[PDB]
Design a protein around this ligand. Structure first.
Ligand SMILES: NC(=O)c1ccc[n+]([C@@H]2O[C@H](COP(=O)([O-])OP(=O)(O)OC[C@H]3O[C@@H](n4cnc5c(N)ncnc54)[C@H](O)[C@@H]3O)[C@@H](O)[C@H]2O)c1
Ligand SMILES: NC(=O)c1ccc[n+]([C@@H]2O[C@H](COP(=O)([O-])OP(=O)(O)OC[C@H]3O[C@@H](n4cnc5c(N)ncnc54)[C@H](O)[C@@H]3O)[C@@H](O)[C@H]2O)c1
Lengths: 324, 323
């Protein structure tokens, strides 16, 4: 049976990928052996994997730890890197750890994959590496122009992975996607922040003029796109996975308030968040040609996410208290 | 004593950085006379205090690492201009082991940009290379061009450019990026193409011609590169990239002929060896629109460079003992 190595698999998107793979949602990949490597930062959460606890081998570790990777990687058919620092606001406060994990950690992992001979490697990345597009969508040929330290670090990781592909023939593919939402997302991100604060009768933030535009995709659709790349993608190539809803932050705010029954009286207007980041939008014609298609309409996925947080306070309440 | 700006040069004991320092101290740039200069350099295999022997009365030297944020917080304040030449710069080394390239060329840049932000440094230049683009056999390049670096050195340099640009866009950090083709001139470490050729020929040894000799590169004399950088210092806009072009795009074949002409050598010494990227080409419309034009014609600069290596065996023979 195929043996899959998932770095960052105790976080939001990584744990979803693991739970889907272990549940048999990807036809063919049944009863796979699965190894999760995760350093369990503030964002790592083992409860995300509790339902597959006895199906997965968990190794606590840092993707920068080349010695540990050398022991653990060999024998795995597939490496997927979900390990990253991912909160833009944190990258604004101090970017040092973003460069360490999202650039140096990528080099460390790619070098360890080269030496261990892993045949399929997927580096998971973000549409924010491209910077703002006022009309239309970026294809995979688009120039990098990140605005935030988080996005510049993701971009730096992508560039070194592709240099390894071009220099050493490393069989790595890159995926890029817009903003994810869904169950088990750490409640510092905008959608779970809103839901959890509103369910507690507390305030929620609206940053700036609200006119920034983002693409929103349910985590299950992102992971299906990733699995498509695993099965049908080519070494050294980038693959976009595009949203199913494009929204200004004002529109997003209204949708979230409606979905939970909140009031605009709960919305704290907060000043500028720093950047040149008006609109991000990808074209995924390239991957849809390989057979990927999103299935989750935004309104249905949002409703399921609201119901999930409403029903799983025991999962998010300790996290809300830790954020304060 | 006067109010002429104080200039901080990271990597200033290297090839290009020490040239910039020497030009600045000599008074090559109008209105920058009497500059105080701080050089911060960790003196890797490529750093050389001999490169500054003549200007030590105007230069304060700090032996340290751009990744040392505490040190930067101490030494940066009071400098009006920060220029970053510190980097690992040999593509061949980056193939052997890229880890130090990422630490210096990416994490070191974030360290320096962050320390500049906290210190209130009003003008910053990140010095970079046309190698971030990857190969271009078809035409030339403008600063919007997409990034497709082929080597780990080029990818690390590209990562540095991006985090510097993110600091500009996120914080308004007043940093500009420059990108140029291959430099040549005095005080270049003899692992690089032209000084390896020259120094081996002077020791009676054979020199390489790379494959078909069809690979093409944009060549710029170090003094032109530095004058281009100073134009960005004086006239550039924060958050922008500027191309700095030289006066010779050459096949390796063409380059070999010029080198043999310049040293009075013969093709008997040239060995063809097996074969990186094919062609680098730079359009500098954005910076020429600011008054910069390259001024060293390639045949002239090469003749001066040959003169320099011929007269400086005491400098490069210890470095040649890398074999
Ligand atoms: N959340 C989004 O909207 C989004 C959108 C596009 C792409 N991405 C990318 O998807 C990946 C995962 O996203 P997420 O929302 O699940 O992030 P997350 O913040 O929920 O989880 C990150 C995981 O990585 C672990 N980790 C961090 N640094 C590590 C290191 N040095 N070594 C090992 N493990 C480490 C953490 O412990 C954590 O479990 C990331 O590469 C992110 O950049 C996310
Ligand atoms: N040589 C070229 O043809 C060329 C072309 C385009 C761009 N560039 C760029 O110009 C810059 C300077 O190039 P160069 O040819 O003078 O390189 P060099 O190898 O001659 O000098 C690099 C200098 O930086 C020092 N250094 C290295 N790491 C450091 C660190 N972490 N902290 C402090 N100092 C450190 C070294 O001691 C050395 O003195 C580099 O950023 C290079 O990428 C060079």
């Amino acid at each position: 049976v195929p043996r899959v190595f998932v770095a960052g698999g105790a976080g939001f998107i990584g744990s979803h990928y693991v739970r889907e793979l272990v549940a048999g949602a990807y036809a063919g990949w049944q009863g796979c052996e699965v190894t999760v490597l995760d350093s369990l930062t503030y964002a790592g959460n083992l409860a995300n994997l509790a339902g597959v606890r006895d199906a997965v081998t968990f190794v606590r570790g840092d993707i920068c730890d080349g010695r540990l990777l050398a022991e653990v990687l060999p024998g795995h058919d597939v490496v997927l890197n979900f390990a990253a620092e991912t909160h833009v606001d944190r990258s604004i406060a101090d970017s040092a750890e973003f460069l360490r994990t999202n650039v140096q950690g990528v080099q460390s992992l790619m070098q360890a994959c080269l030496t261990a001979g892993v045949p399929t490697i997927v580096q998971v990345s973000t549409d924010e590496v491209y910077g703002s597009i006022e009309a239309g969508s970026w294809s995979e040929d688009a120039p990098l122009a990140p605005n935030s330290p988080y996005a510049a670090a993701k971009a730096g990781g992508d560039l070194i992975a592709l240099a390894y592909a071009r220099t050493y023939g490393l069989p790595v593919r890159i995926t890029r996607c817009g903003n994810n939402y869904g169950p088990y997302q750490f409640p510092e991100k905008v959608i779970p922040l809103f839901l959890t604060r509103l369910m507690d009768g507390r305030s929620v933030p609206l940053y700036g003029d609200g006119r920034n535009v983002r693409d929103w995709i349910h985590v299950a659709d992102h992971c299906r796109g990733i699995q498509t790349v695993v099965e049908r993608g080519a070494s050294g190539e980038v693959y976009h996975i595009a949203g199913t809803a494009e929204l200004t932050n004002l529109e997003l705010t209204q949708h979230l308030l409606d979905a939970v029954g909140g009031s605009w009286d709960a919305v704290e207007r907060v000043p500028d968040r720093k950047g040149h980041d008006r609109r991000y939008s990808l074209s995924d014609a390239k991957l849809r040609a390989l057979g990927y298609a999103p299935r989750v309409p935004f309104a249905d996925g949002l409703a399921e996410t609201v119901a999930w947080y409403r029903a799983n306070r025991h999962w998010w309440e300790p996290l809300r208290k830790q954020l304060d």
